[PDB]
Every structure is written in C-alpha cells, then in structure tokens.
Ligand binder design. Structure first.
Ligand SMILES: [Fe+3]
Ligand SMILES: [Fe+3]
Lengths: 446, 446
C-alpha cells in the first residue's frame, strides 16, 4: 500500500475541459470503484481486442457532470465481461530492472500484474514524471519500443496514459505503462520508424499539406485501399497495411510534419481532431442509415488526450511534437483499415433527428451520463467539445485544413448519441464501414 | 573580427566563368548578406541533408549577372529554413590544436562554430594556402579523414571550398573546412581507400576505359544494382553501397585513373563533366514527364569547382589528380544510389519546349536569376557552361567518352529551367529516379 498505488481524486485538477460541475459524492464513489478496478480485474479481458474500459467510463462520465448512481452505472456495465487479474511473479519484478529481461518480457498478457508492480515501485522512487520520461521519452531501445506500444490496439494505452496525467493519479500512469508493455505486437512500430525515416532525406515540404489532403491521396492510391481484406480480420493492420502497404503508407504519412513551434503544435493538434471527427461523422452510406465506425471513433476519443500531452510542461517539445506527428500518421493507417470509406460533407451539414434536434452540450452530457454503454459514446462527445474549443482560434485562418468547423462539432456529437441509443453494445457501432461486407451480414444496418 | 573572417568581394577575380558583367551594386549587396550568413546562421540546418545554400545561391547568381534585388532574393528564399548558428566552445577551440582531440571531435554538428573559429585563427597565422595543404593534402591521419569528408553529402563541402578558392575569400574556405569536420560520416572513406588500394596491386590499365563505360558495367552488375533499397532511405550510401557492394563497386571505380599529365588532367576532368550531365539529362522515363534527379544534379554542380582545383598552382599535381580520381569514383556510387537509371541519348537530343525552345545562355541566366529557388537550378546552368568550353578541345578527338557533346550542353540547361520552373522547391526535382517508387507516390509526376 503506497500513496501512488492508491487512486485518490482531488477537486483541483479534475478534467481538462472543466465545463461541468462534479457532484462531490461521485469523487468518493469513483475512488472506491477505481480502487477495485485497480486490484481486482484484468486489464486485458481477452488476448486480442481486450481492454478494461471500466476506468475510462468512470473517469470520463465524471468530467461530464456525473451523479453518484451514474458512476456506479459505469462499473456495473463493464464488469460483466471483466476477468480476474493475474498473479504477480516476483522473480519477473526484481528482474525487470535488467534491460535484457524487460525486452524479452514484452508482449506477455499474463504478466500485466508484474509490470504494474514494477512501474508503481519505480514511481515511488523517482516519481511519475521521471518514470515516463525514461520509459517513453528517452530515445533508447526500451523507449522507442514502449512509445509505439502506447499507440497499440487503437491508441488504448495512450488513452490510459492521458487520463492519468489529466487527473494526476500515478497509479493510472503505472497501468498505462504496464498496459503498453503487455500488449501483443501489431508491427505498427515498423510504420512509425519508416515514417520518420524518409521524413529525413525527403526535404523540404515548404508549405505543409493539410492532413485531410493526405486522406484523399490515400484513398486514390489503390495499393493502399486494396491492402486490407475482409479475410485479414483482426490482422488488418499487421497482415494488411504494415504487411503489404508499408513502404506506400509511410510515403503519405511522412508528409505530416509538425514544425517545432508551440502555436504550430497547437495548430496541427487541432487539425488532427477535426480530421478524426470528420472521419467518424462522414463515414455514412448515401441511402443507408447513419452509423459510426468502431475504429474511426477511437481516433476521435484519443485526440482529446493528445491535447493533454502538449500542455504538459515536463515533456520536451520535440517529444510533444513527436506525439502529434505519430498520432496523425497512425490515423491515416486506421482510415484505410476500416475500408477507406468515402467522406462527403453533406451528411454532417444536413443532419436532423427529433430526439436531439435541439439538445445542447449540457443536455447531451446529461443524456449520456445515464445511458448504458462501455463509455465510448461519452468519450466521443467529450472530445468533440474539446475539438470545438481548441480549433476556434485557428478555424477561420485555414478553412482548407479543417473539414469540420463551427456547428458541425455539435452535429457530430448529436449523431453520436442518436445512432447508439436503443442499441446493444455489440450493435451500437459498425466494424469496418468501408467494407461492403460489414453492412450486409448485420441486420440492424438498413 | 579579422580580415580573413570578413567576406570582402573584389572586382578582380569574380567568377571562374566570367562570361557575364556583374552589377557592381550586387558586390556590395552580396557582401552585406554573406556576412550575416557567415555569423548568424548554422551551416547545418538539419543533422542529415541540411546545408546552407544561401551562400551558394548568392555567389552563383552574382557571377551569372545578378542584379541588386536578385541577390536579396537568394537570401530571402533560403533564410526561411535556416536555424541559428551554435555557440563556440572555447575549450574545444584551444584543444583543437592537439591531434587526438581533433580526431575525436569530428562528426559533431553542434561544434561547427568551434571548428570555424579554429580554422579562421589558423588562416590568420600561416595563410589559407597553408591551412588547406596541411589539413587536406598532407597524407597524414587527419588530412585523409578530412579529404574524404570534403566529398561527404553530395559534394557540398567541396562546393563551399571551390567557391572559397574561386572568389578568394578565406572566410568561405574556413566554413568549408569546418563543415567537412562537423559532418556525419557516410563511410565513404572505406570506399575511397579500397579504391586506391586495388589501384596499386592491379596493373596495368594500358588503354584507360571511359567513365561512361564503367557506368554501364555497374548497372549490369546485379550485385551493385541491388544494394540500394527504398527501405534504406537516407543511408542508401552508408548501409547500401559501401555496406553491401563495397568490394564490388571498388572494382569498378579503381579503373578510373588519371595519368599525371597536365593535358590528361583537364581531359579527364572534362570527361567527368560530360558523364555527370549525361546522368541528369538522360535519366528520364520513356512515356513519363521529364524531371531531373536531385543527386544527379549535385554531381554536375560540383564539376565546375573541380575545374577550379586543377588550375590552382599551389596544389601539387599528384593531389590535383587524386581529386578528379576520387570525384569520378564517388560519382559512380551516386549513379547506383539513385537507382542506376537507364540513360538513353534520345532524351537529350530530341528536347523541345516552347518556353525555352530558342533561349541562349544569356536568357537562361536572366530567367534563372529571377526564379525563386535554393540556388540549385542557377548552379546547374553555370556548370554546363564550364562543361561546354573545357570539353570542346577534347570533344571530337574522343567522341566515345563524352556522351554529351556540341549542342547537347544547351539542351540540358534548358531542361533544368523547364522542369523546375513553376514548381515549389520540394517538387522541382525527383529524389531517386532509378527507383520506381519515387515516381509513384508523387502526384505531380505524370
Ligand atoms: Fe475503447
Ligand atoms: Fe545543394
């Protein structure tokens, strides 16, 4: 029992946004449940596509004005699928200090408990800021591995990492570092390194291209669009993009360069958020019902937490610039993984539905704090608010790099609640909306 | 503030070519901008492929008949990417007299200012002719490391040096010796030495083979054509040519020897100039557009500065031949790095475009002095002039070693202006034309 491994929320740094009052009984109700999830349940409930969203739903719902029972609502929904946490092999723990052992242990889902004990015990020594800036931002072998593993599994470790920095809870930061260390490899490091590779020789992008301009250039490149197959299934990123369209995707991804200025870093960070929302909202089929993509939304949810990192004064700006660059390049990969679906602006500009035809951010916050899900729909509307705010200082100055502007933000958030209400968790979203097969076999899609 | 460290231009030696009248206001205008670049901006703006062409563009444009507002143009266009010059570490400076410290400090980009201060203070002592003939042509440990470093990075340090000996400004010669000292190593030394190595045991090339003959045999050698890969990217030379085809490529380059005659020195110097222009003008794709290669064009821009060296009386003739020798042996390595693109004479004999179908050397000079570029296209046309004149007394006697002859010199200089007018600096040339990847991912190539 250490002060780090205890999850204690404080009414001081509670929410990046801060546009909602938090019922104080939730904070005592949240910590009580956050501690259970911290020492009872496995982070990975399956080996593949397994993530313990219990903490993410409890935290994000809170920052949107959650009640007491609404916090219990998040724990009760995601515990029905939750599996117990492995034991801690103390031999691995004491051995994880040797650089040779830490690398050979990476990829062990069953060793998550051991990695958590290690990062917690190392945080009790040099602090949560020193651990991250030597296991993530350090440019040595373990860093250049753990850093890519934060983007693994649809940016789920880097979402865990961002929350622990938002509410300042080193126990959470320990989990994210352990989650990234016990993740199966998706070969996405091979894409990150190649993208920063020809970003050296190829010079110079005098006028940096908008990220949306690279999205269109991606879909036209048939080798990229043809890289994912419905037969690849879970290994669309491993045995598809990275496996077939590596050299080609890196050619598009490399052209996304963030100049090392702070306003420029804020500028391009918002560009990624407008693109992510544009991806989840404009991936609709003319003629069919509106429905969001399960992996396009994960590009959006994670965008909010990259605004957390660029504000941290304890990360180097090159690393802060590196986090947005690696973010934007891996998004163009996921856009192809879902099927590179066609994005037209008419669906988001012309969207109406009586249920939320006049709801505001607050009403959406309220209506989302009570609905039963894994927390995904909540995180969407939370990021779309942040995307609206962080883009506005720049929205008018470059209208060609921001496809989502002004009122489109609220529209997408409304579409997020409409298309997932009165639907089970399995049938809320679609998996791979760019694949015509994804809509055929599903009956609820019509 | 020393007389050597002050860039003062005179109307006595203003251009190796000298076939253009120079607006005398430009000389005063060029001197006010070369000094800023001499004491404000870093020689390397990035660690890899980073070079300060501001001095190169201002110098070449001036000798081409630049006006006052055209000298400012070159500075105005290159300063946007420039980064601040590092500080000088005085301990390094005072310790740079010890041979051991000099050898350990090499390769430190952050110590360019320190090397520049050391080479300037040594030129204030024994002169500019004495500093170079003891740190370059001295056959000791340092000079043989620095000489191979003068060819690093596509002959850019020797481009600075050639510009320093041409206009007689010891401040520029200091920057060139400090740029080659602070350069990263591409392992091209291990190719230079193995070139001269079997150029001793193996004997004797009775009738020396032309340099266009060694190109073709190097492309047929599948073990040389296959060493560079698209994944190697930046380090195509370090971890590709020398990394894989060191022993092989050394068998081709060593056959390029220069007999120590003085007419043989200018006959083999002009043969390199015609071989280089043959690489940048014939590297086209039958069916696709016309566009030069970014590294083949660098082999031609440097040929003029090797015409500055063989005329220097203060360099020994044995050292003036080894320069042309090493130059010709590294040019063979760059033909392979770009991809050993097929060179067919038809592309430079049947070249027509209305924009410059009838332009002479005086109009190309006029138009290139007003086009906004890094200075590469102005320096292409200038080297083809020096190549037309110095190859003319040898063109007809050996028509089998001058693949570009007569009117072909003027067709390539037109080709430079057309394919690089109306293009941003990033899209003026292609990077690696022998690789099919280089033409696929670029949309402008059609
Ligand atoms: Fe998720
Ligand atoms: Fe250059």
């Amino acid at each position: 029992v250490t002060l780090n491994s205890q999850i204690g929320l404080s009414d001081e740094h509670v929410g990046l946004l801060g546009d909602a009052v938090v019922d104080r009984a939730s904070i005592q109700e949240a910590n009580r449940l956050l501690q259970k999830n911290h020492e009872e349940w496995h982070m990975f409930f399956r080996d593949r596509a397994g993530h313990n969203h219990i903490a993410h739903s409890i935290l994000t719902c809170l920052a949107l004005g959650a009640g007491p029972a609404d916090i219990q609502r998040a724990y009760d929904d995601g515990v029905g699928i939750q599996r117990p946490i492995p034991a801690v092999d103390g031999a691995t723990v004491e051995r994880l200090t040797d650089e040779a052992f830490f690398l050979e242990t990476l990829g062990a889902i069953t060793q998550y408990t051991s990695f958590l004990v290690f990062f917690q015990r190392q945080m009790d020594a040099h602090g949560w800021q020193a651990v991250v800036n030597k296991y993530v931002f350090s440019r040595n072998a373990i860093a250049e591995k753990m850093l890519a593993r934060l983007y693994e599994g649809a940016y789920h470790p880097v979402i865990h990492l961002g929350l622990g920095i938002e509410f300042q809870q080193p126990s959470l930061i320990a989990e994210a570092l352990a989650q990234a260390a016990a993740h199966d490899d998706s070969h996405i490091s091979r894409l990150f390194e190649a993208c920063e590779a020809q970003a050296a020789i190829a010079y110079p992008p005098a006028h940096p291209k908008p990220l949306v301009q690279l999205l269109r250039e991606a879909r036209a490149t048939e080798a990229i669009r043809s890289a994912p197959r419905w037969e690849d299934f879970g290994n669309k990123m491993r045995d598809g993009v990275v496996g077939r369209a590596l050299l080609e995707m890196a050619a598009i991804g490399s052209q996304f360069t963030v100049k090392p200025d702070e306003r420029e870093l804020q500028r391009r960070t918002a560009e990624m958020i407008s693109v992510c929302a544009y991806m989840a909202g404009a991936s609709q089929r003319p003629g069919r019902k509106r429905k969001i993509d399960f992996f396009y939304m994960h590009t959006l949810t994670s965008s909010l937490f990259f605004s957390v990192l660029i504000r941290q004064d304890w990360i180097s700006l090159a690393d802060r610039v590196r986090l947005v660059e690696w973010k934007g390049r891996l998004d163009l990969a996921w856009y192809v993984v879902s099927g590179s679906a066609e994005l037209h602006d008419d669906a988001i500009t012309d969207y109406h539905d009586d249920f939320s035809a006049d709801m505001g951010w607050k009403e959406l916050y309220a209506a989302v704090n009570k609905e039963h899900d894994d927390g995904h729909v909540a995180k969407m509307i939370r990021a779309l608010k942040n995307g609206q705010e962080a883009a506005r200082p720049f929205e008018a100055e470059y209208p060609d790099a921001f496809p989502v502007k002004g009122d489109m933000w609220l529209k997408i958030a409304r579409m997020a609640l409409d298309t997932t209400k009165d639907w089970p968790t399995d049938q809320k979203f679609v998996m791979f909306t760019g694949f015509d097969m994804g809509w055929k076999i599903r009956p609820d899609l019509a």
